């Protein structure tokens, strides 16, 4: 039943890799908790540098290493400190830089209120409870609004929850339940580059594609149909090479499927001209009647699939 | 004849690189096995942190480091624990994140029930037997069905086998045989992006390729033949740059070979028009007869090579 | 109230990654500060190599590890030295190579007087003051003026400021205020490659785009309109693949938006020819009148958006 | 004159990077050699884990660290073992995973019987001789014949040689000569992907290039000459981006030089039509005579340059 | 005034990254210098392995760690040795593999006699002089002349210089001057791949560009002008993606600027045909007179800008 009061500084959130669904965060954890009141030599409380901590594990000072569940690997314990007060209160801060991983659903790929969920747990302590959470983001992030991608943010929002394992330990009564700190932080991507040159060639190259139907010769309309087939695969060739790649297609490239299938259906009208089953290749009066539903029958698909 | 009961937690499977044929997995191994009953100071059993383990190797506590055969290198022993009971039972868990490597046959490249075969062995112990296997996957993976690529899974399926080396040791009788834990786990890739924009331009650009035969001029049909030659190499140019690369061609690009060879054979009909050995370039009535086998003679190849 | 006099050597600034907004710097920090006058054996002052420092932390020599706030992770303490004078003055130099990160606004992307802001702080010392700053850049960097990108520089410019935390410590009176060294260094990119082949095809492919309006046939003007649509996306395909990528569009690619929208508006004039609501496709005398505002109405946009 | 008997296990050969000319190999080295007969406590011989070896260097057990000359850096000593027999025989195995580098000539780039030459040396021992070599490859590699690139192999083939340095030491008589183990292992690449879609578009795009000469108009033949110039640089654009890159051109791209130079020479015939120094652009009867040497004069170059 | 005789082995020079201006080198440093004559137990001189050196720093053996100024970071001290003679002579060799960085001017980008300048310094020793330099390159590098890029070399050329710092120390008289070993080694790149397919499409695509002027129709000449604009940006798209990238344009791509500007000036002649201010689009007799200066006025630019 040992109390722990935590505090989180957040310096930097960066580097989102979505094939792993990972990101990287930087800041300081701070643990303040009362242990046993010892004497501090001199008057000022004792301080201890990086390697010197490994002198004070030898006499068994109860310093709990606090894991991460979202992490992959082990974060670099860069610098450390023990503000050992003579009243038993211990302050322990640490710079951390780990590769964190949590679920990031892409419901709408440019505009996404996403939620980086940092956490903390005690790795080998059942009911040595984490009493007081504190999120202490203090860096001025919103001010470079056009600059920072994700950091056009809302509000810091901590939480303390509880979780219980049963298969893990042998003692099932009331000492197999871990106190879990779950510090979620929301973030919105700056969608400027993700909207300016992303779907702007997409949504109107189909609005360039309806000029093949206003042609009368199958020497000028076939090479433009081949040009329509070339430019869409050149476009799909432009897509993934910039972006962090995905095992499920983005909302942008839900319409390269249509940039196929519409021209795929336009081949049916071109061959309805070619295999016009009374005369030649010349467009019939039914082909002069689909002249309006060919531009306007495919730009009305963008408003239903969002 | 020392018993060992193991348990595996599985947190994350990710990052498949197939030029190495490797992947990365995260979780906790847990060893529970009875050694010698000592005294635990106080009433609660003894616990030991990360660096403090290296105090307890000095008095020779029998802590077996458990290797991996599928690994390349050495996995990061991030955090550790010794739940030393006074009855002699030892619990030792560890977070692991190693680059594992095992054979992954690509029989069908989008749809593949693949099998990640984690294992464990004792590195330097002959007949100190691993008695009780336990796979304990507990993370909710299926729920984000569209999101997780591989994790649309089946069932956890452990196994304990036996393997024997003979060239390795000098003692051949009954102490050169290792107990091998072989925890296989199946996984199915989410084939959405791998099917939506992968072969959809492939299987019908040939269905765009048969419009060159419905032409009468060798000024409009030659530039479209060159367009057919350009677009297939632009397509092959689109392929590998997204995908993890392969020393053996995927089932998708078994048909860029045909996207050559069909147009390669179409040059024979174009030159049968050009070198029509009685008159000029004009299509003969045999060329007006292959007008049906030219679309429909190559879309029937997709159903035999699977 | 312990005085510290610092000195910074700067050997190399390189490797700007702007998705992190990071760079890498190399040089030597030097701390000169008087502690306590001890005896030096022999006559010459004591020197101490790399690992030997960890003999002299055991007797508690007050060696302050000096952090970095711009860093991400921990820089490699390659080599070290303690010029321990018998009068108490300590000289401590160290080679450093860390990934530093600070805000780099891209107001104008080729021409940018940017400001790499190295810093230093005491990690766990409140009022042990850093008295004397000194920047000592000494490498000849300007001499290879065409060669070095950023190093066409101005002047070294140190500073000593002060910063105070209040939430951090428990003692609020006058011992929660850190002395902060903030050594800013300016740098100008060598814009040769960034100007020679960057916007030179950009600003006049629109000056190639006005030849579609001097055409009379909709068999030659439609395929050139499709060529204009192809070349702009091939250009945008050329852009990002060389450059370090950005979440906000560069000043170069503010005009691929116009390379869309101008040709997008040119489709309105082409369809004003096509849907000329008295006769056919032939250009009216209003279309023969926009022959001058079509070249010269879009090259005058480059002078307002800078 | 201390005898050493070595043994090599080979688990995996992978990851060939040819700009370094490096690869990566995995397996176990095993040293068996008799030192001094000590006592083993109990009856079973002594075993020693990873960190525990550093207790047994303190009493000066003669454990020779065995270097590698092909390596770049230092391989990861993952796990270790000392099977210390009471008769003085020492068995020491180690998992190794190093970046090895040796000369790999590319005489023929798809089909290459290459030779990975692992080695071993004593780093600081002159005439403490390595008596008995043993290569012990035991993994079933050939069975996945289509799958494994290099591992379609021949036979393991060890060797023990001798090498002498003279500039190295000061004692020149008979104690400056190192025993060198040179375990070469051959390997053949699986050339399936390297032949299926590598030169198949190469060797017959020239067989598409001879249709420009069967044209009569310089409005249809010039744009196809420009198409021939476009497609060859689009092809060269396809090449290097998949492949591991080279400072000397592969045998595949010895013919993009000809894919230039042949069309380069075809410009001479096109301008012989254009600058026909009696009349116009119309093809003379000499241009109607080179109609056969233009296809068949360049497909006969593939059989001489191999 | 302590003498040091050095010796350098050079095994491998590889991996030139020019955005850092770095490379990687492998070999052995050897220090031979007389200290104090001690006793060697037995008759043979004492040898000391890797970790065992850290027993002999404890009794304060004067082993100088020798830095590098061209390095970025810290090179991996892989293996080590102390040939401690009883006469006081110490031999210390070490394998090194560091990322070295020195200025590499690109005066001519394919053909460049470049100069890798390795160095050495004493990190914390003023006048403990490095007396005898020795470069001892011994690997057979020239023999694979087509294979090795840089290693078509000249001659090893050592040097010993002197350098003095004044701001560094407090003692200015004669003990603030470091002995600097500066072992420069020249190297010439194998220019085969850098010349075969690098500028060969460059220098004559302009020699393909003068066929637009021999056209009479503005329906065939405008689409070829657009083809000339497309192919040059497709070429520039081919360039950087293979090559190590540069903040200053290579000598190859000094002429894509001209591949713009010449066709840019050709638009002036095309519009001189179009805006021929007496009649129509038809080429005047002045346009029939620039038919010779249009091919031959731009191939004479390659011989002045080198």
What does this structure look like?
The first copy, chain A, has helices spanning 53-56, 193-196, 202-205, 221-242, 256-274, 293-296; strands spanning 4-8, 12-17, 22-34, 66-67, 83-84, 89-101, 113-122, 130-132, 156-157, 160-164, 177-188. The longest helix of chain A is centred in the C-terminal third of the chain and has 22 residues, at 221-242. Chain A has two domains: 1-190, Acetylcholine Binding Protein, Chain: A, CATH 2.70.170; 191-306, Up-down Bundle (Methane Monooxygenase Hydroxylase, Chain G, domain 1), CATH 1.20.58.390. With 306 residues, chain A is α+β, with helices and mostly antiparallel strands. In chain A, strands 1, 2, 3, 5, 6 and 8 form a six-stranded mixed beta sheet that branches. Chains C and E meet through strand 2, strand 3, strand 6, helix 2 and helix 4 of C and helix 4 and helix 5 of E.
């Amino acid at each position: 039943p040992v109390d722990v009061s935590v505090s989180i500084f957040i310096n930097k959130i960066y580097g989102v890799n979505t094939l792993e669904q990972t990101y990287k965060v930087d800041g300081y954890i701070v643990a303040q908790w009362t242990g046993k009141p010892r004497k501090t030599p001199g008057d000022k409380p004792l301080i201890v540098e990086n390697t010197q901590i490994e002198r004070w594990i030898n006499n068994g000072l109860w310093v709990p290493a606090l894991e991460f569940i979202n992490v992959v690997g082990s974060p670099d314990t860069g610098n450390k400190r023990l503000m050992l007060f003579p009243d038993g209160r211990v302050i322990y801060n640490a710079r951390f830089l780990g590769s964190f991983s949590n679920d990031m659903d892409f419901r709408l790929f440019p505009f996404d209120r996403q939620q980086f969920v940092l956490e903390l747990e005690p790795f080998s302590y059942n009911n040595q409870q984490l009493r007081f959470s504190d999120i202490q983001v203090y860096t001025e992030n919103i001010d470079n609004e056009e600059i920072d991608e994700w950091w056009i943010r809302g509000k810091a929002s901590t939480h303390i929850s509880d979780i219980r394992y049963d298969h893990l330990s042998s003692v099932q009564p009331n000492q197999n339940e871990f106190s879990r700190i779950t510090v979620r932080i929301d973030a919105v991507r700056n969608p400027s580059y993700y909207l300016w040159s992303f779907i702007l060639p997409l949504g109107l190259i189909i609005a360039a594609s309806w000029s093949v139907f206003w042609l009368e010769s199958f020497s000028e309309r076939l090479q433009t149909s081949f040009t329509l087939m070339l430019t869409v695969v050149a476009y799909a060739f432009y897509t993934s090479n910039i972006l962090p790649r995905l095992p499920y297609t983005t909302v942008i490239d839900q319409m390269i499927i249509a940039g196929y299938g519409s021209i795929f259906a336009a081949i049916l009208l071109i061959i309805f001209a070619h295999h016009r089953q009374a005369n030649g290749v010349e467009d019939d009066l039914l082909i002069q009647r689909c002249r309006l539903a060919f531009p306007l029958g495919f730009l009305a698909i963008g408003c239903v699939l969002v």
